[PDB]
RNA sequence: ACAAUCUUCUCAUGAGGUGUUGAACGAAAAUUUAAAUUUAGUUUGAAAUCGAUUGGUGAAAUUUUACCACUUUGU
């Protein structure tokens, strides 16, 4: 449709607002919050606003948030924090409680095997694809993801960016399970 | 209330016609939550299914348990009437369905309240699976008192609930959900002290 | 979508805090190295009829930064 001039200015203001927060938080504020209580999170994307800063665009892609509500098993450590804080305005990070991960895997589990949404319905699919990864079933997937097993990164690659379609632009902790409960 | 009274002249008619409602509730207890369905409705259906399983466990009304391809078929005798329910497996798989589910949930709640009153249990029960739902008071011996255990490959909680329903004490791994070791594979090594490798078919055959 | 993260302080006792519409008028000093910054000041409607500084830096896939600024642009 016909875009009105106010929308273009609103994009510029948000961009300048987005650019500023990025400049403060990253440069001269290298200190990071280091999320804890797990080795695995369930980050989701609230809304990637149009015309992102080019820094932002891969942060969704690399940690697998290329689409909205993409809940992914990410290795919880200091390393993800700065990248997530780069993308923190558009994401919610929270802990995948065992029930939430199991419930997600049991019903909404569509693991991105070969980059496609492959349902985790059959425990053999987890067993066959993750035989060397020690994940043998949906319950074992939770042990390898929610409990972040030895091959959690491989399990996460086996897993998918679960679209937990519904959110605050930051910490959730157990609130990711709340979204997962509604999503799954 | 009035619709259920007209549809079911007596509790015997409701019990005989609750097989479809029980099957629908069990199927919806593990179905994904979408726009067509409601999260609260799914939670209510799961609570009704848990209450029905707990009531069957206390009354030991379960008679047969068959491991079918579609799911677990449980046949129970309540007030003489035979009730058959199908429990689908936990696998990653509309207005009329929602209306039928709502009617089934209302019928299940009324049946659970009547069963709890007859057995003396409080309705609704206070709310780990069935462990959260406390049955506070207000084969029939398939595994008797054998303290069976389940690893993180068998139905675990489903095996525990099915055994506890008829006559058993099957276990469940903490993530998944001694005298026996329930596992998908034989897993002789996984069979712990006392826990002998328990194939689900063997337990189902003994129950049936 | 004329909506969004420009700072209730922070640490440590000191240090910081990252941030300013445009235009017009105007001292008189300094260093830095004429432009470059500071630099008495100012005036006005979020005012508006050329005048552009004109390099660098990356950072993607050479045109693209309409702030990317040397500490110099896609994790």
Swiss-Prot record, chain A:
Subcellular location: Cytoplasm; Nucleus, Nucleolus
GO molecular function, one term: structural constituent of ribosome
Location, primary (coarse class): cytoplasm
Keywords: Cytoplasm, Nucleus, Ribonucleoprotein, Ribosomal protein
GO BP annotation list: assembly of large subunit precursor of preribosome; maturation of LSU-rRNA from tricistronic rRNA transcript (SSU-rRNA, 5.8S rRNA, LSU-rRNA)
Job of this protein: Component of the ribosome, a large ribonucleoprotein complex responsible for the synthesis of proteins in the cell. The small ribosomal subunit (SSU) binds messenger RNAs (mRNAs) and translates the encoded message by selecting cognate aminoacyl-transfer RNA (tRNA) molecules. The large subunit (LSU) contains the ribosomal catalytic site termed the peptidyl transferase center (PTC), which catalyzes the formation of peptide bonds, thereby polymerizing the amino acids delivered by tRNAs into a polypeptide chain.
Additional record remark: There are 3 genes for uL30 in S.pombe.
Family statement: Belongs to the universal ribosomal protein uL30 family.
Subunit comment: Component of the small ribosomal subunit (SSU). Mature yeast ribosomes consist of a small (40S) and a large (60S) subunit. The 40S small subunit contains 1 molecule of ribosomal RNA (18S rRNA) and at least 33 different proteins. The large 60S subunit contains 3 rRNA molecules (25S, 5.8S and 5S rRNA) and at least 46 different proteins.
Name of the protein in question: Large ribosomal subunit protein uL30A
Species of provenance: Schizosaccharomyces pombe (strain 972 / ATCC 24843)
From Swiss-Prot, chain B:
Primary subcellular site in the record, as a coarse category: nucleus
Gene Ontology terms for molecular function: ribonucleoprotein complex binding; RNA binding
GO CC terms, sorted: nucleolus; nucleoplasm; nucleus; PeBoW complex; preribosome; preribosome, large subunit precursor
Keyword terms of this UniProt record: Coiled coil, Nucleus, Ribosome biogenesis, rRNA processing
A GO biological process held by the record: maturation of 5.8S rRNA from tricistronic rRNA transcript (SSU-rRNA, 5.8S rRNA, LSU-rRNA)
Superkingdom of origin: Eukaryota
Subcellular compartments: Nucleus, Nucleoplasm; Nucleus, Nucleolus
Domain (BRCT): residue spans on this chain: 139-208
Record carries keyword Coiled coil: yes
Quaternary context: Component of the NOP7 complex, composed of erb1/SPBC4F6.13c, ppp1/SPBC19F5.05c and ytm1/SPAC890.04c. Within the NOP7 complex erb1/SPBC4F6.13c appears to interact directly with ppp1/SPBC19F5.05c and ytm1/SPAC890.04c. The NOP7 complex also associates with the 66S pre-ribosome.
UniProt similarity note: Belongs to the pescadillo family.
Task of the protein: Component of the NOP7 complex, which is required for maturation of the 25S and 5.8S ribosomal RNAs and formation of the 60S ribosome.
Name of the protein: Pescadillo homolog
Name of encoding gene: ppp1
Covered range of the whole protein: 116 to 429 of 607
């Amino acid at each position: 449709t016909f875009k009105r001039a106010e929308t273009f200015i609103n994009n510029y203001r948000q961009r300048e607002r987005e650019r500023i927060r990025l400049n403060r938080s990253a440069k001269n504020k290298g200190d990071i919050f280091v999320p804890d209580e797990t080795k695995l999170l369930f980050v989701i994307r609230i809304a990637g606003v149009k015309n992102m800063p080019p820094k932002i665009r891969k942060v969704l892609r690399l940690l697998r948030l290329s689409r909205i509500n993409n809940a992914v098993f990410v290795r919880n450590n200091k390393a993800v924090a700065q990248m997530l804080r780069i993308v923190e305005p558009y994401v919610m990070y929270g802990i995948p409680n065992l029930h939430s991960v199991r419930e997600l895997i049991y019903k909404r589990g569509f693991g991105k095997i070969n980059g496609q949404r492959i349902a985790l319905s059959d425990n053999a699919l987890i067993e066959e694809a993750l035989g060397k990864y020690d994940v043998i079933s949906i319950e074992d997937i939770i042990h390898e993801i929610y409990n972040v097993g030895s091959h959690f990164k491989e399990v996460t690659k086996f897993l998918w960016p679960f679209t937990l379609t519904p959110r605050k632009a930051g910490y959730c902790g157990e609130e990711i399970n709340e979204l997962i409960k509604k999503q799954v | 209330d009035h619709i259920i009274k007209e549809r079911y002249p007596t509790f015997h008619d409701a019990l005989k016609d609750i097989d479809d409602a029980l099957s629908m509730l069990f199927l919806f207890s593990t179905m994904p939550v979408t726009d067509k369905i409601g999260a609260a409705t799914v939670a209510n259906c799961e609570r009704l299914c848990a209450e029905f399983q707990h009531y069957v466990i206390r009354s030991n009304s379960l008679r047969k348990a068959f491991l079918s391809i579609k799911g677990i078929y449980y046949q129970a005798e309540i007030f003489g009437e035979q009730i058959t329910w199908i429990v689908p497996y936990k696998f990653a798989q509309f207005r009329i369905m929602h209306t039928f589910l709502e009617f089934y949930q209302a019928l299940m709640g009324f049946v659970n309240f009547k069963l709890y009153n007859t057995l003396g249990l409080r309705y609704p029960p206070k709310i780990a699976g069935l462990a959260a739902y406390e049955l506070e008071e207000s084969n029939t011996s398939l595994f008797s008192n054998f303290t069976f255990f389940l690893s993180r490959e068998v139905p675990r909680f489903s095996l525990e609930f099915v055994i506890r329903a008829f006559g058993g004490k099957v276990g469940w791994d903490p993530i998944l959900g001694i005298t026996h070791h329930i596992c998908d594979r034989p897993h002789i090594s996984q069979k712990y002290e006392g826990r002998i490798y328990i194939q689900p078919q063997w337990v189902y055959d003994s129950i049936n």
